[PDB]
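Q: Joint fold for the lines below.
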Amino acid sequence: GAMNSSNYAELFNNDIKLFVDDTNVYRVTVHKTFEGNVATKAINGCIFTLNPKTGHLFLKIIHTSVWAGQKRLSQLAKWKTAEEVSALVRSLPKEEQPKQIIVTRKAMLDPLEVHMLDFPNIAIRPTELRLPFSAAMSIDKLSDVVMKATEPQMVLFNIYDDWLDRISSYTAFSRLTLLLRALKTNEESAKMILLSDPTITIKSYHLWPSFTDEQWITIESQMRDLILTEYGRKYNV
Amino acid sequence: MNTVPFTSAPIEVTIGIDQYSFNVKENQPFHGIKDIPIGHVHVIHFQHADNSSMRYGYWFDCRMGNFYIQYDPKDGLYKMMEERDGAKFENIVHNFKERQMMVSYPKIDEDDTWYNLTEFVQMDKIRKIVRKDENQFSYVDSSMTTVQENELSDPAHSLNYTVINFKSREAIRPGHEMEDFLDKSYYLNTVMLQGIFKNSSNYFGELQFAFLNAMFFGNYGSSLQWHAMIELICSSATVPKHMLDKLDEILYYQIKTLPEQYSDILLNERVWNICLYSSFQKNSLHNTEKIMENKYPELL
Ligand SMILES: CNCC(=O)Nc1cccc(F)c1
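A: Joint structure:
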């Protein structure tokens, strides 16, 4: 069924699962035409597919050429996502295939269920969590590879860097959602927080800075403060 | 004109014959139904005065044999039987019609209702849906489940309707997942019409049979089947023009005949609103939309 706070430890058990987020698949800029009408121009996008236990991120880049000459792009994008997820599963050895795929928006259920009819033992599930994965494009290295791509391409990352050497997957996931929620609520402040200190750097093979245990607690506290802040500024509290 | 005689009516019962019905009181001198129009299937059905639980009944075609009803006090129901020797069957039926012990099937001459509800229903196809081959007539009741209901218990007492499932490998071609899911024309026309039903008359006959079992017995699996078969047509972008026109006529008479007080349970709000207002065929069911909107505007 659906995925919520009562079964949240399930994400970190030993059944392979993937989250699929389609919020950045179809991306547009809206602008005025010479005649004073409005038109859209698409820009590259991505499917964000993540194993929450391992941190493995299967980032499928959606090049704008996949929309050329297509109609009803918002609907096509859900089916394109499902096709790519199905192709990914099929590419994985059987022992690496997920037992569950959890979609962050309910509109993906039918498209993915249809594309995975071949896989009746794989459960397709929604979630009641409001996960902040749409902010994935605020991670500079991810945004850079999407915007530079000249063709469809799959790029693999670990979204937890080396964190699992020191913390559990539950704590790594919680850190990730806090960081992404902050970037979603106020990207400038979140980024200032993360990079203010010039002595903490991002290793070439990582996405986030190389914080010690102590500095991650400071950082985590500052991100909570930010998410409290903007919540006041937003609601005047 | 043919006759369904009764040995007796030992228990009080409401008797249905097609869309008509009348009450028989316990041990009332009733010996059956006469003047039944030849040329159409028929259904004779029962609801006991004591136990409204279990509506039940028999689909039959008078051209296929000489049938009578005998109450069975062990199984507790009115059973349809077959008389082998036609000579003796005629000796009894005449004797009773002389003593005027029968209700007359009450067809109005302006009324084509029964015809319009059973146009495509054939007894040979009923017997494939209801598997009990040693009888030329077919028993149905309220509680019988469908083959698909047994997949989601007794297989012998099931309704073997054609399984329709929009999220199945049969409904969806590899590589056209989106196309086939949003426009069901492949499943309707290639899989079902050409592959399984052979023609639209057999498709419409199953649809009509499913509605009648829903309406007369409150059979829930039949109601699901009727809606499924409507939805598959309405959700197909490419449907022969003559099927659409006939569909509109079929549904119009079904909606016309439906008891107003049963609409809440027999009509699926989602299917009808989708079909009339959202689907590829939203503009193709003029008669049906007009009657639905004037008779059941609540549902919409
Ligand atoms: C018991 N012998 C069989 C039998 O009763 N047959 C029959 C035939 C016609 C009408 C009827 F009421 C009964």
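Q: Anything notable?
A: Chain A has two domains: 9-163, 164-237. Strands of chain A lie at 17-21, 27-32, 38-43, 45-50, 56-62, 100-103, 123-125, 153-158.
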